[PDB]
Ligand SMILES: COc1ccccc1-c1cccc(C(=O)O)c1
């Protein structure tokens with residue numbers, strides 16, 4: 666069942682923005698969103714693709730574990746945190762595209778395509794360059810499809826090993842305190858219009874889990890912090906977090 670709550674639009678408009686938040690109550694199997702249409706519109710996944718990419722790299726042995734060091738290639742890039750060595754944990758934390766581009770090359774087109782189909786991930790279309798298709802190729806995924814994929818990951822139901830799924834969920838760890846745990850991944854899509862920011866993941870409570878997926882218009886990098894800020898305002902309004 667699905668319910669549309671347009672009152673959340675206030676959280677976007679008060680920030681002169683537009684977007685969608687989708688929430689899923691796992692216990693009650695009920696979904697909530699401010700915009701049913703946009704919840705089902707398909708966008709480039711951008712760095713949210715690091716979730717499936719990590720799973721595939723681990724399950725194929727391209728990545729041994731979360732400690733393996735991927736050495737900086739020595740090319741100075743405009744994002745300072747990328748000009749350093751990384752492991753899976755820090756590569757996720759800092760959305761280190763060049764590390765995941767190498768993952769994709771080693772995975773290869775054939776295995777990547779098969780695995781995304783097994784994951785039922787978005788439109789499952791890797792058309793484009795194997796090392797950038799999630800940034801400017803043909804792959805697309807909606808906010809509701811992100812939730813479906815994330816629910817499988819949470820339950821270890823994706824068609825990779827349990828170990829691979831546990832490692833990626835560890836690497837998704839974003840926030841934890843005495844009230845909740847958030848495992849999530851941000852995304853920032855600029856190469857194909859409309860430019861958007863993503864935040865997808867879930868909130869673990871003592872007795873329930875709330876999956877979430879949001880995207881919003883992102884004409885400049887100035888508003889990136891609104892991805893988390895708007896989501897949490899919705900979570901607070903729905904009394905999911907204090
Ligand atoms: C394509 O990443 C960027 C492009 C332009 C400006 C900043 C970034 C950036 C770099 C790393 C993480 C994030 C982020 O999702 O918060 C954003």
Ligand SMILES: [Cl-]
Nearest residue numbers: 834835836838
């Ligand atoms: Cl953990």
